[model samples]
Target chain A: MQIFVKTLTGKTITLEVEPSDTIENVKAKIQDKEGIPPDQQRLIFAGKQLEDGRTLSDYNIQKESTLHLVLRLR
Target chain B: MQIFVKTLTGKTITLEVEPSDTIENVKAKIQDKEGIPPDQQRLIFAGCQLEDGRTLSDYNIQRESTLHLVLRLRGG
Candidate 1:
């Protein structure tokens, strides 16, 4: 599936991932690609926690979907 | 010059450019970079308007600086 992840710097990057990918996997991938520290990653989907351990489908993140990957300061 | 820009979703991205770049210029660049609409761009620097038509130095956004780009949602 394709997903649009917006970085903290306000840059949007599109990536392809399998539907079976877990949120933890996504987070790790994001960290690797964006150079964002794992500890500082916090995701907010429509103003809620896009926490790890959840699946893409679990968060309703489907093809062409937009997900906000917030860089946590705390 | 270099600066860090944060998005509405609270994501952060860094870029490099000149110091004389205006807020309007930054906004325009952001639109081009993030595909964000002009009407939807609302910037906040330490909890204030990062209003456009101003300069990078005017807003004091410098190298390695971090700014927040928030999407406006009007609702009760």
Candidate 2:
């Protein structure tokens, strides 16, 4: 399935992933595509922080689900 | 110039804007399109809140820049 992720920098990139993919895996992909360090990435959905070890399906991320990306600039 | 605004719900929409447009004008446009009240809208860029009276260019918002839209949940 595909998910929509929005960065604080005003980018919305859609990526294809599996239900078993972990949030850490998503962060790694974002780091590769956006040049942001994984440590600095914070993914939020429905006002909750997605833990790195949890699977996408664990958080119930469906197709077209949107994730908010906040970068730790400091 | 144009501006990209991302809503709290994760919807990103582009607006055709002028450098001289006040933040209030932008909020008004958003109100029209999104059904959000101008007073309820809070726009943030580069970690600073954009005041309604200030011009967009005053905040140095240029093409492709993004503004985060936050809505006030309640008023006391």
Candidate 3:
């Protein structure tokens, strides 16, 4: 489905995703697409911390939705 | 797999997930686990944007790598 992904420079890029992928997976994907650093990468949804190794359902994200991805420069 | 996820205001939370999960999925999980609002949730890695619906393979993340999850704020 399609969703909204944001970058550290305050850039939002919308794209499609498969049903069988994890947060880690998405982060990596963005790194490749946007030429970002892996160490400084971060994912924030609904203004909270995304627990590693958790499923999307854990975040309560329905199909065909939007999410934000920002850089962790702290 | 197991990985590291950090939050805004300097908070780190560790957790696990299936191989067939997506970033959007992970975001949802964090909200449920930590009570974060959906509107302010954002995911970043290696300093970049998640390109909406892309998969993890695109980013080349490892099986047990540590990733950060920070909140995006523009102005005070």
Candidate 4:
């Protein structure tokens, strides 16, 4: 399914993904599509932080659902 | 069996299979791709939940078989 990832700067990236895709996996896609590296990526949904080790479905992400992305400062 | 882990979106993940791959070992490989912990992995095959102690062949699994992975609750 496809979902929207809104970045910290209000850039929304549409991505094709599966519920089984881990947050880490999504992070890489975001990197390729937005020039944001996985190491600097963090995801959030419904006000809850998304963990790298958790799948998209683990947080009940659905088609067209919006995930918030924030940068991880070094 | 040709092992595949079905995701919630109905997408499948392929895993290298060996008859010797126990349920636990399979879970470990599942852990590798899906980022789900082994202890939290609950596998269902052919309508039966596979036991960690059992082998894929024990369940009569062979080429072109798939496993279902259900996530268990985690403690905060």
Candidate 5:
């Protein structure tokens, strides 16, 4: 399965993965590609935050669903 | 004086300005280039938080000094 993650500025990156992949796994991939640390990555879908331990399927995240990725700096 | 702003990941952007430029103005320029809003910009210099209304010189920010830029996420 594949999913699309988008920034508020409208940039999107697509990730190829299995439905069994946890949100944590996806965050690791994003960190590799985007240089944002997993801890700083805030993944949101439909305005709800995604938990690291939960499977992609658990959030009902299907192919083409857009995840909003926000980076926290403090 | 010109200043260097760096992200947590080490990406740096240069800002050219007078010593009197307000931190808010610098943040506005960062917003233009980085797509992060001025309100969301968190600037740190020498481990001190730079306030928006304060001039760069007020914090004694010098040319070539690196300011850390971080985006504040919702509730952050």
Candidate 6:
């Protein structure tokens, strides 16, 4: 499935993911794509924090969902 | 996306789902198909219990994912 991440930098990135990809995997993929460290990015959806161990479904995120990619001190 | 629910009674039911379909929504679809109550069926994936509010992605149950369907006091 595909997902969108609207970053704090004001740019939205399109991400392709599978159902088995957990939050951690997603974080790392973004880090790879954006050249940002995993901890440097804080992911949010529906104004709620996401856990590493959980997948998008657990957090109520779907393929068409867009995530709030808020960044921390980098 | 499509998902398969393997029932305890020995049948695998095919279900088509969407990106936003959550566990609650999925449960109801199966109930409508199998003529079973939502509460009477327990869904399991990745060796864990699924929460009603969460979606299939949350359970790590993606397309071609097969879920474990265990019955709860439904003996019909």
Q: Considering only N, C-alpha and C atoms within 3 Å, which residue pairs clash in candidate 6? A: A57-B57, A57-B58, A58-B58
Models 1 onward score TM values of: 0.50, 0.52, 0.45, 0.48, 0.48, 0.49
Tens digits of per-residue lDDT for model 3, A1-74: 66667544446676556656677666667777777665567776788756557655677755755566656665
What shift in Å separates residue A62 of candidate 5 from its native position after superposition? 1.0
Taken over the whole model, the C-alpha lDDT of each candidate is 0.73, 0.86, 0.64, 0.82, 0.82, 0.80
Candidate 4 lDDT tens digits, A27-60: 9898888787798888989998888999999999
DockQ of 3: 0.05
TM-score of candidate 1 against the unseen true structure: 0.50
Once model 3 is optimally superposed onto the true structure by TM-score, how far is the C-alpha of residue B53 displaced, in angstroms?
Answer: 1.6
RMSD, candidate 6, Å: 12.9
Model 4: lDDT to the true structure: 0.82
Candidate 2 interface RMSD value: 8.0
CAPRI quality of model 2: incorrect
In model 1 chain B, where is the ten-residue run with the lowest total lDDT?
Answer: B51-60
Poorly placed runs, candidate 6 (over 4 Å)? A1-74, B72-76
| CAPRI rating of model 5 | incorrect
For model 3, the superposed segments whose C-alpha errors exceed 4 Å read A1-74
Clashing pairs in 4: none
lDDT (tens digit, per residue) of candidate 2 on B1-76:
8789999999998888898898999999888788889988899999878888777766668888899997667678
User: Candidate 1 lDDT, tens digit per residue, B1-76?
Assistant: 7787888677776767577886777777788788887667887776667656556655456687787887666789
Candidate 1 local Cα displacement, residue B49, angstroms: 9.1
Q: For candidate 5, what is the lDDT? A: 0.82
* Model 2 pairs whose backbones collide: none
DockQ of each: 0.02, 0.02, 0.05, 0.01, 0.01, 0.04
Those runs of model 4 whose alpha carbons end farther than 4 Å from true positions after fitting are: B1-76
Error of model 4, residue B36, in angstroms: 55
For A1-74, candidate 1 gives per-residue lDDT tens digits of: 78878654445667778778987787878877878776787766776877678888887777888777766677
- Return the top candidate by lDDT: 2
Give the poorly placed runs of model 2, Cα more than 4 Å off.
B1-76
